[PDB]
Ligand binder design. Sequence first.
Ligand SMILES: O=P(O)(O)O[C@H]1[C@H](O)[C@@H](OP(=O)(O)O)[C@H](OP(=O)(O)O)[C@@H](OP(=O)(O)O)[C@H]1O
Ligand SMILES: O=P(O)(O)O[C@H]1[C@H](O)[C@@H](OP(=O)(O)O)[C@H](OP(=O)(O)O)[C@@H](OP(=O)(O)O)[C@H]1O
Ligand SMILES: O=P(O)(O)O[C@H]1[C@H](O)[C@@H](OP(=O)(O)O)[C@H](OP(=O)(O)O)[C@@H](OP(=O)(O)O)[C@H]1O
Lengths: 590, 590
Amino acid sequence: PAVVKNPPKLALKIDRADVNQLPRNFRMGSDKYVGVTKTGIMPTRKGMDTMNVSASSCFSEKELEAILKKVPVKPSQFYDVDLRGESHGYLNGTAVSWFANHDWGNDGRTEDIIIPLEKEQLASLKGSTVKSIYRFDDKKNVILSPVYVNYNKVRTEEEMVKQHGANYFRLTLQDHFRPDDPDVDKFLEFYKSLPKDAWLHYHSYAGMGRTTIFMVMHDILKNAKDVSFDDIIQRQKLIGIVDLSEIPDKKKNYGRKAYIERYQFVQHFYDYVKENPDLKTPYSVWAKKNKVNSWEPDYNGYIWRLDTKDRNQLPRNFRTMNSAFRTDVNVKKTGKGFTPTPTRKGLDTLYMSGSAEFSNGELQAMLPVLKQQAKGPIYIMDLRQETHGVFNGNAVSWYGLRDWGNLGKNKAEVLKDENSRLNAARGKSLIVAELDKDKMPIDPKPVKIESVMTEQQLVEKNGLHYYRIAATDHIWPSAANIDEFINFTRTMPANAWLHFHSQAGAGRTTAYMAMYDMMKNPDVSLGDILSRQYLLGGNYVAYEIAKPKPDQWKADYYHQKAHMIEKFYQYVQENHADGFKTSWSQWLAA
Amino acid sequence: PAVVKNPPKLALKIDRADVNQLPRNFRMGSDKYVGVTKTGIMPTRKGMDTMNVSASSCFSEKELEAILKKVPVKPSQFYDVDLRGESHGYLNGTAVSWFANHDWGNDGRTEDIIIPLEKEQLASLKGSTVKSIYRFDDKKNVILSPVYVNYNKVRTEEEMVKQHGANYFRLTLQDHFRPDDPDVDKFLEFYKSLPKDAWLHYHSYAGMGRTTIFMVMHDILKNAKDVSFDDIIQRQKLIGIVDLSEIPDKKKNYGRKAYIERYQFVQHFYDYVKENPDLKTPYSVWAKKNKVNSWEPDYNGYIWRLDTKDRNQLPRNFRTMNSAFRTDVNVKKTGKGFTPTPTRKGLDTLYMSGSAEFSNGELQAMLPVLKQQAKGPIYIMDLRQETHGVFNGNAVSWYGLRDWGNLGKNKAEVLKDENSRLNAARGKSLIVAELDKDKMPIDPKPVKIESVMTEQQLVEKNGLHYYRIAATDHIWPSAANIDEFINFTRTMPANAWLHFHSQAGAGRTTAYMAMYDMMKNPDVSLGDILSRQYLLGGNYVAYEIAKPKPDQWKADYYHQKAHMIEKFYQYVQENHADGFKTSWSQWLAA
Ligand SMILES: O=P(O)(O)O[C@H]1[C@H](O)[C@@H](OP(=O)(O)O)[C@H](OP(=O)(O)O)[C@@H](OP(=O)(O)O)[C@H]1O
Ligand SMILES: O=P(O)(O)O[C@H]1[C@H](O)[C@@H](OP(=O)(O)O)[C@H](OP(=O)(O)O)[C@@H](OP(=O)(O)O)[C@H]1O
Ligand SMILES: O=P(O)(O)O[C@H]1[C@H](O)[C@@H](OP(=O)(O)O)[C@H](OP(=O)(O)O)[C@@H](OP(=O)(O)O)[C@H]1O
């Protein structure tokens, strides 16, 4: 085949043709040494034969079958450790993946974007039984002219491996680099939970870099006590293909840094296992204390943000389902299904409103409006995961990078963090600043904090009910968070009026409003729901960035929203009839 | 101007037009804060006003004059700290440099290569008063359409700066990265040697990355005891342009790694100054001990190499000036000035030979041949810096990466290492292996070491004189090594017969043979000298790699040879008449 001159940015290509054989770079930990060391002296073989470990390149289905046959365990004892962060899967037995330059198809992405993205990519191939798929040169890592692949099955690696009765574990590691600390932590917690008779097979794309790092880690976990670091590095080269201590002349600038980085990593992991033979202190914790940690963003709050100043007027982005459509329509901020003239059916009895966060003054202005229109009890639905409250009548929040001050916290932890920080602020003189477009404070000055309430205290004091869902800013509400809302709707009083707010009354607020609208009016089209929620003053839930630039970190998260809001529409179509007896989480998991 | 679609791999372009002004990103350590921090809280200014420091982008001559006028010291107190590893200089007052993609013109090169290479690049412009020079866009860092520049002066930055009565210090740092540990050590020895009233001006190309790293280091050296790491980082952003703690969303994969690497560097440097306020322990030594050191190659010997087996035949590549011209001429391994029919004028009375290293058996075969041709005392001129000797009649050496086992050592240290290691080998059972094309041992097996001698003992025991010059393998003989040979010729007998040898009888041997040939026959052309030394069985001293690939690390060293052998030719022309009274070192420095 011929090299493809201008390949797409992301090309679906063949990883492994389906052939009855052991795959590329296959080795078992008990294999004999091949080749020599630079000194001519062989490293001790101590501990090698009882490691119960093998490794290789990625594999087709027939190559997996050859692996399973060869290893001296049953499938039930076999764990496929899939180190590939790049999106991949199977068409029948043929292994395919989505390739970008340097094999960085999922460059920068976290596991929780990569896993569902990969399923979607693969899902897009179902409903066809033949496809032109690029070939690939492993020597130069470049796209070659395509062949047609026939198939009637599309599977993730997990599905294929489990259908063979084996076990599966995924780490989404970028090609060319060491695992970051949290992925080391994740591996170790998996490792510690293994049955003693477990057989581990590590693989990446080529069974070279990422694979050898983990073969070295494995050897260290079994043998660091009795075997030197240097011997481990050498012996994993002798039975394999890569010497992690080799920084060759041909590697320069960036590539050279990465070879250096991953060599240093295995040195630090060796030291960690040596000092912590019980594996009690997590690697990330040990590494931080010893200043050899990988870098991670810190999302913790570091400033009191002024969300909204105490003012006698309706809060920003306020609307009810009786409101007028907006006149400032921007089609470029809409998306799939958008119409300027959606049906208003059901809106007169939906009893729903939304807005940005509210100061005391803004709550006072909302009160008569909502009571004017409400036919039953009024609930303020606070959708904010981030810690917030009221200082001197002003709405404030504890702002961290990306507004992810409470990322990873459950509801109980959120409320505990919230109460604690608000209390601690009482009577202090603190910076409370509005943030500009760059999230930098504007004219920051200390101000004396005289009064401090939670929003709940404020809301209940004014005769309304309160409910909190801790939804993370910028992202599609989690399954748990959506289930919490559905459960809420099942028991809420009839004629209840729901007022949703988040920080800006945009992303999270419009998402929940659209989900509730759908639930109550399943006969209205997805596009009409999204369109009217937009027209009434929300954003468009299915917005996607046309041509994402590198600094546009929200791109994947908008895409996830666009995708998941459609799914949720389907969920409603299928479960509204019997009152949603089946949950969103259970439905997803089927 | 217009972007250049396909610029040359290396393009001479304009850095700074000559303008009367302070340069880009100019700041002084005592400057006021501009902008805000993310918390809205400003860092202490403690110690800022007494640091006696400024920083900026690179500067034109007039921009330097603006700098000198602005700062509150005399030029004699001002130190230009030039952080640029890329080759640069001055045409009249205009700053110019040689640009490759990512500003990596000298990617991978050491200071010893870059400094003389830069002077050579600038020297190539001195035979003109006008040049077409590319323009440059600082926003995108890309070459733009060229303009003509007129000049009658070509200068290094050092020359331009010293001509204004100021001081100069150079570190050859690659753009985009932190400094490696040895450059930190070099900066520190410089810093500690400063007078108290010294004023430091740091600059790189943009006054952004490398410059801010060093401004932070300075602030740390002055203020670590009293000011926190975070405050230093913030305040250097506030008076400047870069926050080293910021890893922006737009930086991905490789670029991201570099930002991370340099942030972590300034953290480690902080800790080092905090822990070592006396700056006694070097940074590199502290960093190693704490496992946060940058990676450096290790050139130390790790194996006994079999250089040549004891055998009853002339040593490899043996030749005298009465030897036949070779029949296997390969023009592609020749170079500038090659002729297949050079004069043999002077060879009849040039009492010289050369070969590869010799075993005992090969020395015995040599003896009658040399004694046949010699008209005076015979001297064996051992040119090897690397440690070697004789085991059981075989020539052996202590081999390290690149055969640089004794890199950096003086002659006394080389001989001390040599005696020590040879003695320690006696009676031991050790690996003594021939190395393959990849420098890996062939069929290594331990052998009993029964007899051990230095080459000097072997030679003198056979009634010959010995002299040692510790020349590093692969590279052009140093100035001190050439002077040492010249001093030898000045005190040796008229009709002394010199037999040069190294490991292979190629690079070092042929260079010294060509240098002596020139000295004794200054009326023979450079080309003829190099050509006949090649034809008699040496290599071609002025060989350069045509189109050097990334793995061909010797490229720069061959170029250095090709260059310096011509220079030595000129030295001979200018100094043979009086018997080389002025040394090579003195003549180079003028
Ligand atoms: O081609 P061979 O001699 O087998 O070696 C290759 C080339 O040097 C590649 O460079 P190039 O793209 O110039 O061919 C290099 O990728 P980089 O260019 O990214 O350094 C590979 O590094 P790894 O991809 O790390 O194996 C290295 O293994
Ligand atoms: O709080 P909800 O109602 O979900 O709405 C969010 C917040 O207003 C975000 O503000 P912040 O990030 O300051 O908390 C905003 O980010 P920007 O102001 O950076 O755009 C989001 O814009 P998009 O993520 O672009 O939709 C918006 O959807
Ligand atoms: O264009 P602006 O917004 O100024 O930001 C630039 C771009 O992101 C560059 O990327 P691109 O080449 O895609 O334009 C990037 O170089 P990399 O591509 O090496 O990341 C620069 O990093 P620095 O070179 O470190 O400034 C960064 O400052």
